[PDB]
Amino acid sequence: LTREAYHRLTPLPHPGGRLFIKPGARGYRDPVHDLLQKTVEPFGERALDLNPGVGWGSLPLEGRMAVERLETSRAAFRCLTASGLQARLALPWEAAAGAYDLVVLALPAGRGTAYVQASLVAAARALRMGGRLYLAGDKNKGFERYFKEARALLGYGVVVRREGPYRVALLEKEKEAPPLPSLWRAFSARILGAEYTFHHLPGVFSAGKVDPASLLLLEALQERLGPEGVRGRQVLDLGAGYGALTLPLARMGAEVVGVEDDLASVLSLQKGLEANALKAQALHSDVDEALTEEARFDIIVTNPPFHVGGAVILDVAQAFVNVAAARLRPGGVFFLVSNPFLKYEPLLEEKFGAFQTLKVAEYKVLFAEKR
């Protein structure tokens, strides 16, 4: 896709209306959300959707109930807003307690057990006594385990729709919700001779340890540019996460801007910067959406997202490369790290004209220079 195509919001028809989608936004052609859309019915007056994506799953409630939506993805919030659907940039556990009659939760299984648990408890806390939860998921991705936990938190629960491995259950709050679990985790790492303490919320990439690919990128970067090669330079970190690249580059004296689509990750980066007495801009952004049109950089770095066991480069990851080429000044440089067999080489050749391979073992570090 072109940059404009990546960032474009496209409305698709459904009976009575339209819904905006875009590349990089969850909840489109997603069987879990599709099953919710076929199943959810109004109950009471106030509903809360804790993982809406583009908003298809809970859409049947719109215009029949008051619906609030809490969403961590900037890309998804762009879509919801374009669709005229009320939505807030918010973590699931930021939901008001005891304020809702109905909650809708497509299980965020891809973000892991702790994130799902925090979402389940947030759902339980959000409901008034006697309120109900629509819980949807995939038996291949923890549905039975998470449904069992929801039943323990809430009370009576029953499957109300099934299609292949996909499930929607309906549950009733019959008991008091517990307190939120502890959400913050910290760990310390020595990177290129300096000590860092990273801080993060549930669901982030590489919780609890610095990703070996990210370390490899930093090693290749310091080898290529020197320990002083980053000082005073403007750096863009595409997909900054909790700051595995951002913090060291800041410490090395770069002027760093991190862009990150996931709110939980943005807050994680902010806490790490503070705890380590480092300054950088930690932006909640769908790729470079938060940047001015004119912003350019001397160095761009990325450990892009990837589909686990996938063989195909993700739309977001392809956009990272396109944006990198467009956002570099003449003579600026790009570092990208990936799994060894992802086909980034032709993409770099197309957007930059040439590329180099700085490292290749467990991961490959690719390099390109803006002409």
Ligand X SMILES: C[S@@+](CC[C@H](N)C(=O)[O-])C[C@H]1O[C@@H](n2cnc3c(N)ncnc32)[C@H](O)[C@@H]1O
CB 309 → ligand X: shortest distance, Å?
15
Nearer to ligand X, 123 or 317 (CB): 317
Binding mask 146-185 for ligand X (x = CB under 6 A): ----------------------------------------
For residues 72 and 78, give the distance between their C-alpha atoms in angstroms, rounded to a whole number.
Answer: 11
For residues 161 and 128, give the distance between their C-alpha atoms in angstroms, rounded to a whole number.
Answer: 24
Long-range contacts formed by 341-348: CB under 8 A, 24+ apart: 341/311, 342/306, 342/311, 342/313, 343/313, 344/313, 347/313, 347/318, 347/321, 348/321
Contact 131, 173 (CB under 8 A): yes
Which of 206, 219, 253, 369 contacts ligand X by CB under 6 A?
206
Instruction: Return the amino acid letter for 218.
Output: L
Asked if 54 touches ligand X (CB under 6 A), the answer is no
Which of 32, 75, 109, 252 contacts ligand X by CB under 6 A?
75
For residues 56 and 28, give the distance between their C-alpha atoms in angstroms, rounded to a whole number.
Answer: 8
- Stretch touching ligand X by CB under 6 A, among 115-123, 237-245, 324-332, 357-365: 237-245
Helices 344-352 and 315-327 cross at an angle (nearest 10°) of 30
206 belongs to an annotated ligand binding site: no
100-106 and 88-89 strand pairing: unpaired
> Measured at CB, which residue is nearest to ligand X?
239
Helices 143-154 and 113-126 cross at an angle (nearest 10°) of 30
Which of 104, 260, 352, 364 contacts ligand X by CB under 6 A?
260
286 belongs to an annotated ligand binding site: yes
For residues 293 and 256, give the distance between their C-alpha atoms in angstroms, rounded to a whole number.
Answer: 17
DSSP state of 61: G
100-106 and 46-49 strand pairing: parallel
211 belongs to an annotated ligand binding site: yes
Nearer to ligand X, 79 or 287 (CB): 287
In the numeric block, which tokens belong to residue 363?
Answer: 């991961």
- Stretch touching ligand X by CB under 6 A, among 83-91, 143-151, 257-265, 291-299: 257-265
Which of 244, 247, 328, 333 contacts ligand X by CB under 6 A?
244
Binding mask 2-31 for ligand X (x = CB under 6 A): ----------------------x-------
Asked if 211 touches ligand X (CB under 6 A), the answer is yes
Which of 259, 267, 324, 347 contacts ligand X by CB under 6 A?
259
Q: Which residues contact 323 (CB under 8 A, 6 or more apart)?
A: 3, 238, 287, 288
214 belongs to an annotated ligand binding site: yes
For residues 20 and 96, give the distance between their C-alpha atoms in angstroms, rounded to a whole number.
Answer: 27
262 belongs to an annotated ligand binding site: no
- Window 311 to 340, contacts with ligand X (CB under 6 A): 316
Q: Which of 155, 200, 154, 193 is nearest to 177 (CA)?
A: 154
287 belongs to an annotated ligand binding site: yes
Nearer to ligand X, 212 or 227 (CB): 212
Contact 61, 104 (CB under 8 A): yes
CB 204 → ligand X: shortest distance, Å?
7
Which of 70, 245, 263, 348 contacts ligand X by CB under 6 A?
245
- Stretch touching ligand X by CB under 6 A, among 52-60, 107-115, 239-247, 363-371: 239-247
Asked if 202 touches ligand X (CB under 6 A), the answer is no
CB 315 → ligand X: shortest distance, Å?
9
Size of the site for ligand X (CB under 6 A): 22
Q: Which residues contact 12 (CB under 8 A, 6 or more apart)?
A: 18, 19, 20, 21
Instruction: Scan for tokens 């007056």, then name that residue.
Output: 45
- Window 261 to 320, contacts with ligand X (CB under 6 A): 261-262, 265, 286-287, 303-305, 316
Task: Give contact residues for ligand X (rule: CB under 6 A).
Answer: 24, 75, 205-206, 211, 214, 239-241, 244-245, 259-262, 265, 286-287, 303-305, 316
Residue set of the binding site for guanosine: 211, 303, 306, 339
Residue set of the binding site for S-adenosyl-L-methionine: 214, 260, 286-287, 303
